């Protein structure tokens, strides 16, 4: 009898792989996936890598990979074998030629490179089955995203393992490749928004005009998505564009251009009034091109933290964005304010402006610092309606 | 030269205590407080305990207390010396008679008892100076509260170390003893509410009628306060009463009783309508006795999780309370709804009810699951006012 | 394939339980007993607990119980799962809802409570078979007794697991329940004595009059029994009474009362002489009611350490009892001394008194500090007999 | 500034040594003794060794000696530096030429050899002051004795560090050298006995005839003395002779020889009777040459465990000795038995024999298995005397 | 089911031994050899020891042997069970009577003694098969040699496990016993040389005259052989003699004696000249008796480091030998120099002497410090030949 990793992978049964996985870990479930491989040439080694069904839980070095040299056990703690983001993989390495400090490092690097390559290969194998991938990605999506934040070397492969709900995907997640395949002729950006939940993101005001124009928007639901989007600027030559931020332009018709410029001018006074009324609470007030059904939204700066990122941070300094209010120039409420300002009906305008602002915090993904102050405006607004 | 703990405490200087504290810990600051004591009689030992200026940060046993027997070092890991909630204290114990398993346990218990006693004594010494206590309590308030949750033996002493802002304390915290001293003649309960911040709690709708009646309310701002209030039912013979919960009654005049009963009946139809309109979203709708200026609030059940507790949990099962809506029968909005229901003006009532409900979530300390749905009602309500 | 603990216990074979026990411990023997259970409701978890056939052997936390959350391994070191006295149990816990510090503690407590409950259930199952219990109790009797010394919550169940030889049990141990069933009509106390061995205890002078009266006496042979008897005052409403101590009275007839009082008075002079002769070596000399065949014994104080406890301590301060000498007023030797004192034949009385004292140390469970001094009296006593 | 060990020892003050001792250990007392030395030639190193005032308290290697190579810290765990019995010494080693496995071992051995040499030198320095040695030896006597049990290389030096009370030393301990100086002309053996305490040993029956003859006897009071006396047969060419064992002869006159032989024959019948009466309880009964004042003793075999050793073992197989009874042929009791046997007055002889036997257990350093059986004989013996 | 070690060894299958070996180690290969034994008498224990197929790889104690007492696991770290040189053996010990410090040490020693005995027995069993031994010895030859360097107690058995190529063994290794069997009538020494490789040693100049005389020479190829030969002076009463050192004499005929003495005198002038020419580079120049075909060699001192040992050390002080040049008095080159010196053709002699010296460094197992200086002499020597 001989170690399992030294056998021909076509001769090992699923049950043998499973029992060996259990022997080398604390898991009592069968592994979700297995990759048994060998590397020949400059370096020679053999290896079995496993993906568990479930994601695993200071002074402790990571011990997911047992190290053997020429079939002799060395240690279970060799961190250099495997990057932190792959820490969930359990396996063995048996190296024929590990041996003074730098020769060893070169060998460890080459081994790491190949382990990553083969793990990526394995995840791509899992992805052939939709249901299996769904379950892998629920457990290890965070890990792939971590890999993107640091393993610039495998960017494309890692990016292709990502999944996201979108405005076009329905009750299933889509891939970035398929998002790109569905892109319209002159579409330059891949649009996304971040937030707490799909339910909330799918009724988001930020995507109103994108929907009408046929621009698919990706929903990014995970705290980590925020950091990934800081490091990653594009994919298959298309830029990411966040629809909760300044700096996002839709592709416009020459006719559309003029329509927007004409609407901008008509709202200049209203914009300036709302700014003056709101003081330091916003950086500015401008005419939106993102809204259809909503009167206004609060948008974050191009380079700073988003609303969603901000509240992840408050819950858990010079990076948090000032807010920009954007107005729907076609919305009835906005139209009425423009006229009441055009004739400034001045008292009521203030109340209305703060009410729109405070409500925009709620819809734009911010918390209200002062809910009873806000309640007071709601109550006054209701009193009006009632009599 | 001899160990510092074996000297007469009246002969040791602050600088000697400080250098010894630094030698036995990783802190490079002077300790905030020092307690050097000895126990005689059944057991004999000597000890120096220190409180640090700042609160300290799986397989590791706690090592805040070095153990010596007859001046000989034994271990730094003897957990039995000191309960977990005192883990922040650094010190030494030198026992003359530690020695087979049970004789040792008895001795360890008696030593623990005395360490707790003397640490409590020390905190009470720190409390003589307001500014020093302010700083101790900011760091170790959590620890005292933890002690209350488990050290039933020292309840009173621990309870007397607590501090809270209240409706009467101003920009300073008060004690429970002083709260009790300020209590009105027939006052039975110690009133409190929990929440995110003092700023928010001081404008809370839950305390409107308590203020008018001269009932002081304590503001409890810390996640842990929630658990303390589960274990602790009273203090100096007065019950705690949470003003965000059902089951709280103010002491009433016979005249006040009748006034409330008469107001209850007049709102029965409105209450039943609002229930029918709201369906499963509330357990019931009733007439409040807590409100003065606000139209309504959402209150939690007597035995279940509070609003504040709930959102600590969502962020971090059969314990989360159903909500009860309470109405201010004297509030203009409520009066108008009563009449519009008394004559049911039926369409608009629904909108108004959900609007009041959703706003109550905001003021009663809950999150909105659906902010764009809520925005839609706000917008419709505004449209009414504008025309 | 799935973890064994997640299967229906009625479907797992003894061999499966055995192999799993071996996989999670260092034992290569089958477990003596197995308890596979689940808890539903507030908390949900599943668990397998094992009792080994043999009792197992500073910086090391106890690792008898592996912890899993939702089938994912967490740690093997979670001490909160299981009290120290159950440290011999090997098992796994798989919790569906372990998750910030206090919510976790509550869950850990509830889990501990249930583990203790189910282990106690298991020991009670083992007890259905006499031979199996005999073997369990030989290994883990010390553990049950430790549990009694600290787990006040499970007093009755733990007390019912105890076994002791008694004056009525023969070559088998009895239970406390059966002792109580055999108690005479007006019997108030459960009588016991402690000592080195059954052989020695069954010929003990302390039980002479108890035997004649039909009062069963329990023999307590283990060092730990001493501590258990300090904490535990009674069982099924009957007090424990130590027959090696002062403070023990048999239930007497009105006729028996008078007989004892009359015998007391007749021995007052002898008692006072023996005291005067013995000086500080005893607290007092009194007439016994415990003796039948022996002339005298040494008895320990009601609240202090017993003879047996004392010698456990010397071998391994203000707790060790002064001795009280009790005399058999009907014994020939005592009768002769009473007359020789009544007429004080004064020289020989001294020798006789110390001889009785030193011999009483031997029979009452004390060591002789001065065996050659004692030999000298024996030799002088022999010389008399020989001529 | 430079490491203290690299300074000239004549230039370092007691206070510098003390502070450095405290820095490298957990002791807060000044060291009792200091040895700062260097080795030159084949190997070069420097070292400071300390003896603490008090004796210090599985996976942990011993860390009493810090290791430096060329002033660079290596480890504190190098066990090879210092034998286990010197584990109480705290110090540093700074080696100029530690560097593949065997060259290092040679160097470690030579270093160990020199450390032992210099520690032995230091203990011999402490011994110049009687009071200081008294205190060292109370703490570390066990260590020197351990060294003798294994460090055959330093036998003489270690043997000269030993101290013992003796029949001639008074309230002070003596040395082996001085014992040898006091030996009589033709004295071949160094006599000793072992036991619980000096008080008991000084009234021991085993030494009665040794006292009269002017043979000094050493009192060995410590459990470890038993093992030392197993390994060590002699000192300065004189054998050790245990006076509690068979195989010990005093030097006799030709006249003394005949006297003993004549007494042997006269007691042959008594000896054989006592054997027959005692059965398996003794190996034999013989005439003693050790007794003067006592009638008899129990002696242990030449090669087996002594009485004292036996009871150390029972408290904590084929090594425990059968007992031999030796009789004082000149003792009145023995004389009377000889005559009563010479005429066998047969009933009473049995009682007397067992009484002498059981009493001999007490004086010869054994426990009584059956104290109430023994009490019964005492009582019967007393009854005789009383009438 | 019961632990494997408690079964009768004749009843356990190879597969059971293999699976148990894998369970207790990190090896996934079957063990190379197994020894399952028990010891009865004074001590009682049972044990299984394994030899792995391959040799295994600071704060870590050695854990090759699991310790059980009465079937209960104690620790895997008990170093006292097994000497460091046997550290490669994996096994279990189950002791019936391990239990205060010294009784335990005695038991541990006796256990160690028996483990070594049985491991030695096992290696001797492996040696029955040539191919199996070849493979064992390639892995663990270093270990046996380490054992010889320290386990003086098992010298003969360990020495018999050694294997070496020799001038007579061919492509196979021989044993020391067989070397001794092949020794000539009056042969006193066992001859050896050390060096880098068999290939190099078999063409060594040091063995030229030994071959002609029929004296077998052992080739010692391993760094450790150097240390073994320092500690071990002989085997089956024959001394080891190193042929690279001074102090080695062949057994000579009376006729051979005279022949050598006559050749010595004739070369005295040449020897003295070469010394004068070479200065401090050699200790002396003498006539060799070891050479046949070579003109000269460099030999090391009797007590110091050899050439091979020296270069092990340089690569990895007062121990490194000065060199002695020995000349072949019958070699043509030496003859010509003798005549050119006899007539001193003085210029060329110097060049020739250094050339012979530098070349001798190469053949005698030393490195050249100055290869371009040496190249210059080679070039000048070539220039002569070419013209």
Which residues, 6+ apart, have CB-to-CB distance to D40 below 8 Å? none
Number of A/E CB contacts below 8 angstroms equals 23
Q: Say how far apart CA D197 and CA E95 lie, in whole Å.
A: 34
Order the strands of the A296-299 sheet from edge to edge: A284-287, A324-327, A296-299
Q: Say how far apart CA D193 and CA D190 lie, in whole Å.
A: 10
Out of B1, B3, B74, the one facing D57 most closely (by C-beta) is B74
Listed residue (D225, D224, D219) closest to D203, CA to CA: D219
Can you list the pairs that B279-282 forms with residues at least 24 positions away whose Cβ atoms lie under 8 Å?
B281/B323, B281/B357, B282/B322, B282/B323, B282/B324, B282/B325, B282/B357
Chain B residues within 8 A of C224 when measuring between CB atoms: 102
Three-state secondary-structure class, residue D94: strand
Q: Say how far apart CA C272 and CA C280 lie, in whole Å.
A: 13
Chain D residues within 8 A of C370 when measuring between CB atoms: 199-200, 203
Which residues, 6+ apart, have CB-to-CB distance to D387 below 8 Å? C336
Q: Say how far apart CA B294 and CA B331 lie, in whole Å.
A: 7
The per-residue DSSP string of A273-318 comes to: HHHHHHGGG-SEEEE-SS-SSSSEEEEB-SSSB-HHHHHHHHH--T
Q: Which of A3, A19, A67, A73 to mutate to test the interface with E (most CBs of E within 10 A)?
A: A73
C325: left (phi > 0), else alpha (psi -120 to 50), else beta? beta
Out of A333, A352, A386, the one facing B336 most closely (by C-beta) is A386
Give me the torsion for CA of C347, C349, C350, C355, rounded to 10°.
130
The per-residue DSSP string of D133-197 comes to: HHHHHHHHHHHHHHHHTT-GGGHHHHHTT--B-BTTTTTS-B-HHHHHHT--TT--EEEEEE-S-
Three-state secondary-structure class, residue A92: strand
- Domain range D245-387, CATH architecture: Up-down Bundle (1.20)
Q: Say how far apart CA E12 and CA E3 lie, in whole Å.
A: 11
Give me the torsion for CA of D241, D245, D247, D249, rounded to 10°.
60
Order the strands of the A33-39 sheet from edge to edge: A33-39, A45-51, A90-95, A65-69, A72-75
Q: How long, in residues, is chain A? A: 387
Q: How long, in residues, is chain E? A: 387
**H or E segment to which residue B319 belongs:** none
Q: D147 near D140, Cβ under 8 Å?
A: no
- Domain range D128-244, CATH architecture: 3-Layer(aba) Sandwich (3.40)
Listed residue (A358, A351, A226) closest to A297, CA to CA: A358
Q: Say how far apart CA C73 and CA C94 lie, in whole Å.
A: 9
Give me the torsion for CA of B207, B211, B215, B220, rounded to 10°.
40
CB neighbourhood size of C267 (10 A): 21
Experimental method of this PDB entry: X-ray
Which residue precedes each gap in chain C (C to N above 2.5 Å)?
57, 99, 316, 344
3-state secondary structure chain E: CCCHHHCCHHHCCHHHHHHHHHHCCCCCCCCCEEEEEEECCCCCEEEEEEECCCCCCCCCCCCCEEEEECCEEEECCCHHHCCHHHCCCEEEEEECCCCCHHHHHHHHHHHHHHHHHHHHHHHHHHCCCHHHHHHHHHHHHHHHHHHHCCCHHHHHHHHCCCCECECCCCCCCECHHHHHHCCCCCCCEEEEEECCCHHHHHCCHHHHHHHHHCCCEEEECCHHHHHHHHHCCEECCEEEEECCECCCCCCCCHHHHHHHHHHHHHCHHHHHHHHHHHHHHCCEEEECCCCCCCCEEEEECCCCECHHHHHHHHHCCCCECCCEEEECCCCHHHHHHHHHHHCCCCHHHHHHHHHHHHHHHHHHCCCCCCHHHHHHHHHHHHHHHHC
The per-residue DSSP string of A347-370 comes to: HHHHHHHHHHHHHHHHHHT---S-
Instruction: Return phi, psi of residue E44, to 5°.
Output: -130, 120
Chain A residues whose C-beta is within 8 A of a chain B C-beta are 58-59, 199-200, 203-205, 294-295, 315, 332-333, 336, 348, 352, 355, 359, 362-363, 368-375, 378-379, 381-387
Q: Which of E2, E67, E69, E71 to mutate to test the interface with C (most CBs of C within 10 A)?
A: E71
| CB neighbour burial string for D104-131, b if at least 16 within 10 angstroms, e if fewer | eeebbebbbebbbebbbebbeebbeeee
Listed residue (A104, A106, A124, A128) closest to A116, CA to CA: A124
Contact B97 C317 (CB under 8 A): yes
Max CA-CA distance within chain B? Answer: 93
Three-state secondary-structure class, residue C233: coil
Out of E58, E224, E318, the one facing D75 most closely (by C-beta) is E58
CA distances from E381 to C116, C301, E281 (A): 95, 110, 21
Chain A residues within 8 A of C4 when measuring between CB atoms: 28
Chain C residues within 8 A of E74 when measuring between CB atoms: 57
Out of C18, C30, C56, the one facing E72 most closely (by C-beta) is C56
Look up the CATH number of domain E1-127: 3.30.230.80
Q: Say how far apart CA B310 and CA B195 lie, in whole Å.
A: 11
> Token match 């009674």: residue?
C234
Q: Say how far apart CA C127 and CA C136 lie, in whole Å.
A: 9
Out of C58, C99, C100, the one facing B75 most closely (by C-beta) is C58
Which residue precedes each gap in chain E (C to N above 2.5 Å)?
57, 99, 316, 344
Q: Say how far apart CA B151 and CA B133 lie, in whole Å.
A: 21
Q: Say how far apart CA D174 and CA A96 lie, in whole Å.
A: 68
Instruction: Return phi, psi of residue D77, to 5°.
Output: -110, 15
Contact C58 B42 (CB under 8 A): no
Contact E26 A73 (CB under 8 A): yes
> Token match 């080795």: residue?
D39
Q: Say how far apart CA E130 and CA E122 lie, in whole Å.
A: 14
Contact E57 A74 (CB under 8 A): yes
Six-digit token string for A156: 């494309």
Which residue precedes each gap in chain D (C to N above 2.5 Å)?
57, 99, 316, 344
**H or E segment to which residue B96 belongs:** none
Q: Please tell me which chains touch E, using 3 or more CB pairs under 8 Å as the contact test.
A: A, C, D
Chain E residues within 8 A of D313 when measuring between CB atoms: 103
Contact E28 A69 (CB under 8 A): no
Q: Alpha helices, DSSP H only, in chain B?
A: 14-23, 101-126, 130-148, 155-159, 176-181, 198-202, 208-213, 223-231, 254-266, 268-278, 307-315, 332-342, 347-364, 371-386
Three-state secondary-structure class, residue B169: coil
Instruction: Return phi, psi of residue A167, to 5°.
Output: -60, -15
Q: Say how far apart CA D360 and CA E161 lie, in whole Å.
A: 58
Q: Say how far apart CA B266 and CA B339 lie, in whole Å.
A: 10
> Token match 């623990």: residue?
B112
E strands, D20-78, where?
Answer: 33-39, 45-51, 65-69, 72-75
Q: Which of A25, A28, A88, A90 to mutate to test the interface with C (most CBs of C within 10 A)?
A: A28
- Domain E1-127 shares a fold with domain E128-244: no
Q: Say how far apart CA B46 and CA B40 lie, in whole Å.
A: 9
- Name the DSSP letter for residue A174: B
Which residues, 6+ apart, have CB-to-CB distance to E310 below 8 Å? E300, E320, E321, E366
**H or E segment to which residue D309 belongs:** helix D307-315
Dihedral sign for Cα D194, D197, D198, D202, please.
Answer: negative
Six-digit token string for E287: 């006539």
Listed residue (A289, A325, A320) closest to A305, CA to CA: A320
- Every domain of chain D and the residues it spans: 1-127, 128-244, 245-387
Q: Which of D102, D223, D228, D316 to mutate to test the interface with E (most CBs of E within 10 A)?
A: D102
Q: E282 near E324, Cβ under 8 Å?
A: yes
Beta bridge partners of E324: E284, E299
**H or E segment to which residue C330 belongs:** none
Listed residue (B80, B25, B79) closest to B48, CA to CA: B25
Contact D382 C333 (CB under 8 A): yes
Can you list the pairs that E33-41 forms with residues at least 24 positions away whose Cβ atoms lie under 8 Å?
E33/E122, E33/E125, E33/E126, E33/E132, E33/E136, E34/E122, E35/E118, E35/E119, E35/E121, E35/E122, E35/E125, E36/E5, E36/E9, E36/E12, E37/E9, E37/E118, E39/E111, E39/E114
CB neighbourhood size of D290 (10 A): 20
Q: Say how far apart CA D230 and CA D149 lie, in whole Å.
A: 9
Listed residue (C174, C195, C175) closest to C235, CA to CA: C175
Q: D123 near D132, Cβ under 8 Å?
A: no
Contact C27 E70 (CB under 8 A): no
Give the closest-approach CA distance of E26 to chain D in angstroms: 20
Listed residue (B277, B294, B284) closest to B330, CA to CA: B294
Resolution value, angstrom units: 2.5
Contact E54 A70 (CB under 8 A): yes
Contact D383 C203 (CB under 8 A): no
């Amino acid at each position: 009898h001989k170690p399992l990793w030294t056998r021909d992978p076509k001769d090992v049964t699923k049950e043998e792989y499973a029992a060996f996985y259990k022997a080398i870990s604390n898991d009592w479930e069968d592994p979700a996936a297995t990759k048994h491989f060998s590397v020949e040439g400059q370096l020679e080694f053999r290896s079995i890598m496993f993906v568990p069904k479930r994601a695993p839980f200071p002074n402790k070095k990571r011990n997911n990979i047992k190290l053997y040299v020429r079939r002799v056990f060395i240690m279970d703690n060799c961190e250099d074998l495997c990057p932190d983001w792959l820490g969930f993989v359990k396996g063995v390495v048996d190296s024929e030629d590990l041996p003074e400090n730098l020769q060893q490092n070169k060998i460890l690097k080459v081994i790491r490179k190949n382990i990553v390559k083969k793990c990526l290969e394995m995840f791509d194998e899992v992805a052939e089955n939709k249901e299996d991938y769904k379950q892998f990605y629920e457990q290890f999506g965070k890990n792939i995203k971590l890999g993107i934040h640091e393993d610039t070397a495998n960017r494309k492969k890692l990016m292709e393992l990502l999944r996201f709900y979108s405005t076009e995907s329905g009750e299933e997640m889509t891939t970035l490749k398929d998002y790109v395949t569905r892109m319209k002729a002159g579409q330059k950006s891949i649009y996304y928004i971040t937030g707490d939940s799909k339910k909330k993101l799918e009724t988001s005001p930020f995507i109103e005009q994108a929907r009408r124009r046929g621009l698919e928007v990706l929903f990014m639901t995970e705290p980590i998505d925020e950091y990934v989007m800081q490091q990653v600027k594009d994919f298959e030559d298309k830029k990411f564009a966040c629809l909760t931020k300044e700096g996002v332009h839709f592709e416009e018709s020459e006719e559309e251009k003029q329509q927007r410029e004409e609407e901008k001018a008509a709202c200049e006074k209203l914009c300036k009034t709302m700014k003056e009324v709101l003081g330091d609470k916003v950086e500015k007030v401008i005419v939106s091109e993102r809204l259809s059904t909503s009167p206004c939204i609060l948008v974050t700066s191009e380079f700073g933290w988003s609303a969603h990122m901000e509240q992840i941070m408050r819950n858990q300094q010079y990076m948090m964005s000032k807010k920009t209010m954007e107005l729907n120039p076609r919305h009835p409420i906005i139209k009425e304010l423009r006229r009441r300002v055009g004739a400034d009906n001045d008292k009521a305008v203030k109340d209305l402006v703060f009410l729109l602002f405070d409500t925009s915090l709620l819809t734009s993904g911010f918390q209200l610092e002062d809910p009873t102050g806000y309640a007071e405006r709601i109550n006054r607004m209701i009193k009006l309606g009632l009599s």
